[PDB]
Write a protein that binds this DNA or RNA. Sequence first.
DNA 1: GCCGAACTCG
DNA 2: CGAGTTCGGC
Length: 152
Amino acid sequence: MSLLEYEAKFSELNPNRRHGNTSPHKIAMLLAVMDLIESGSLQENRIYFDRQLKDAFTKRFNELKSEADRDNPHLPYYHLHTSGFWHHQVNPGQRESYKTMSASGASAIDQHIAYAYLDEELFELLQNFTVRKLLTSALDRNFAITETSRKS
DNA sequence: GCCGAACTCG
DNA sequence: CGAGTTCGGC
Ligand SMILES: [Mg+2]
């Protein structure tokens, strides 16, 4: 799809919410992926559930988190697939388990998913500084006006 | 850190 | 009703 449609989807990731507060996991993971691209740490469209992703997620997650949020990178790593541009390369022999899997922890991710990957169009677009700046602003639209002071 | 259970969103 | 979170006993 087009840059317009990605901008729209990055603005509406359907994050978990509770009493007005938005779980920032899906935002922090997309920001971490864009960070990795920017730094040249993610040259191929192949996003492993590894220390490098977890550290980049934690850096962004800590910037956004409230006291109630828990550093659980396995959750957006799985649940971002409802966005339509975030996909899972499923491990050999795991195709049927994957269908009813839950992202209950790291071993559940590692059993089922070899790595995550993007739409090829999105991956190419994110090579572009202007696109990353655009989609970064789009991600902030997931957060309510009332929490912007603590979560932006 | 695991996952069944609980919770809230919509 | 399912999605996407946190909780709690282990
Ligand atoms: Mg909720």
